[PDB]
Amino acid sequence: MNLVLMGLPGAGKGTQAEKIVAAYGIPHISTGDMFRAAMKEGTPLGLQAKQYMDRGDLVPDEVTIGIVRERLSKDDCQNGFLLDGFPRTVAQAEALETMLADIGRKLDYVIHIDVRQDVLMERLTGRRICRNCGATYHLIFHPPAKPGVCDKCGGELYQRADDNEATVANRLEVNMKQMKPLVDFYEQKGYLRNINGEQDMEKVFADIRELLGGLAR
Ligand SMILES: Nc1ncnc2c1ncn2[C@@H]1O[C@H](COP(=O)(O)OP(=O)(O)OP(=O)(O)OP(=O)(O)OP(=O)(O)OC[C@H]2O[C@@H](n3cnc4c(N)ncnc43)[C@H](O)[C@@H]2O)[C@@H](O)[C@H]1O
Ligand SMILES: [Mg+2]
Ligand SMILES: [Zn+2]
**CA distances in angstroms from 175 to 143, 169, 203, listed in the order given:** 27, 10, 25
Mutate to test the pocket of ligand 1, among 45, 48, 59 (most ligand atoms within 8 A of CB): 59
Rounded Cα distance between 94 and 92, Å, is: 6
Looking at all shown ligands, the one closest to residue 12's CA atom is 1
Q: For ligand 1, which residues put their CB under 6 angstroms from it? A: 7, 9-15, 31-32, 35, 52-53, 56-59, 64, 85-86, 88, 92, 123, 127, 136, 138, 141-142, 171, 200-201, 204
How far is Cα of residue 121 from the mean position of the Cα atoms in its chain?
A: 16
Among 65, 54, 92, residue whose Cα is nearest residue 171:
54
Q: Is 177 a catalytic residue?
A: no
Mutate to test the pocket of ligand 1, among 20, 29, 35 (most ligand atoms within 8 A of CB): 35
Looking at all shown ligands, the one closest to residue 196's CA atom is 1
State the method. Answer: X-ray
Rounded Cα distance between 143 and 137, Å, is: 6
Amino acid at 70: E
- Domain boundaries defined on the chain: 1-217
Rounded Cα distance between 85 and 129, Å, is: 19
* Cβ count within 10 A of residue 102: 11
Nearest CA to ligand 1 atom 42: 12
* Cβ count within 10 A of residue 7: 22
Rounded Cα distance between 181 and 139, Å, is: 32
Q: Is 13 a catalytic residue?
A: yes
CATH pick for 1-217 out of 3.40.50.970, 3.40.470.10, 3.40.50.300, 3.20.20.140: 3.40.50.300
Contacts 24+ apart (CB under 8 A), 202-205: 204/12, 204/15, 204/16, 204/113, 205/16, 205/19, 205/20
Q: At what angle do helices 181-189 and 90-101 cross, to 10 degrees?
A: 30
Nearest CA to ligand 1 atom 47: 141
Q: How many angstroms does the Cα of residue 39 sit away from the middle of ligand 1?
A: 17
Reduced to 3 states (helix: H, G, I; strand: E, B; else coil), residue 174 is helix
Between vectors from CA 97 to CA 91 and to CA 99, what angle results, nearest 5°? 95
Rounded Cα distance between 15 and 160, Å, is: 16
**CA distances in angstroms from 99 to 71, 95, 187, 202, listed in the order given:** 11, 6, 20, 33
Query: What are the φ/ψ torsions at residue 26 (nearest 5 degrees)?
Result: -105, 160
- The resolution in angstroms reads 2.0
